[PDB]
Design a protein around this ligand. Sequence first.
Ligand SMILES: [Ca+2]
Ligand SMILES: [Ca+2]
Lengths: 275, 71
Amino acid sequence: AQSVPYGISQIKAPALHSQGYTGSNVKVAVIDSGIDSSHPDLNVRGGASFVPSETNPYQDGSSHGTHVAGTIAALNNSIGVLGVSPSASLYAVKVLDSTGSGQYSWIINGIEWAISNNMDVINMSLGGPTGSTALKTVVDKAVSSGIVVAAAAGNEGSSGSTSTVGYPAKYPSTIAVGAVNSSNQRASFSSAGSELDVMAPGVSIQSTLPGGTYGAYNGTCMATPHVAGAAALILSKHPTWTNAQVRDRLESTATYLGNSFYYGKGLINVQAAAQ
Amino acid sequence: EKKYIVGFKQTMSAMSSAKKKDVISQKGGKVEKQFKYVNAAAATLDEKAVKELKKDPSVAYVEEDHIAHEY
Ligand SMILES: [Ca+2]
Ligand SMILES: [Ca+2]
């Protein structure tokens, strides 16, 4: 039997599925530690690896990329879980090794791959506290090319009025994604700052793990794929909408939660956004 | 040596697949990759190479190739 993780219901993705919209033909790059494409609850259509010591993108020694992939597009069937956009085409763009670490140049190579292979959506459930000119340039280019880029805001919590939002989420072109629990409360680890754009479920998020298993993790990284999948749903229903239009709808129709320093525009509502 | 990203000025030289390589390669630097969409290159550099590069009319910046982590 299939379970529907609470976060998937929380952003109102099932309403889109009932309308007949599930992310079909929308190409989503998972720029992460790889995706174990042997998982029976996942379909992976392609990808590439820029991690020098781990050149097969369909192997994931961290589990992070597989878990993110399942929140985005775990298959709608009789097993495991359900992703936000279960018919989306997933691409394994491996830029982190099995420890979940990656050089910025590898990440850039992964983003450039996404550009060159006409991805519709990029998910980056990763960041660091350091900025990079090359990184900004590449993310800005992906966005000016028409690609939706969702980035984890970071898990550095709050520090008085100083922004703890990491990179590349800090840059204006990306959609920075914070984390809320099932009560719509900000998780205390979720980074804060005026760069925050939206929140999504990021506490106790059940999804796919390598080896055909399932498990829950917490993080703005688990929150991010909710937003990448939301984008996939919206574009499967509005295939002419640009990335800026997708973003504007996700933010303008978000459920207000409070002070935008801690919550951005609030919790995404994919049902409202895709009206 | 360290892991760096070397960026180039829009047209004030070096972009070209070869003068880019050349630019870094002839300061001790070593190139692992030339970015397709970014006017930059991932390279390995000693301290001398950094100083020379930063001061090249073709170079806009010399930044450390930082290490991110799963968020
Ligand atoms: Ca399933
Ligand atoms: Ca941003």
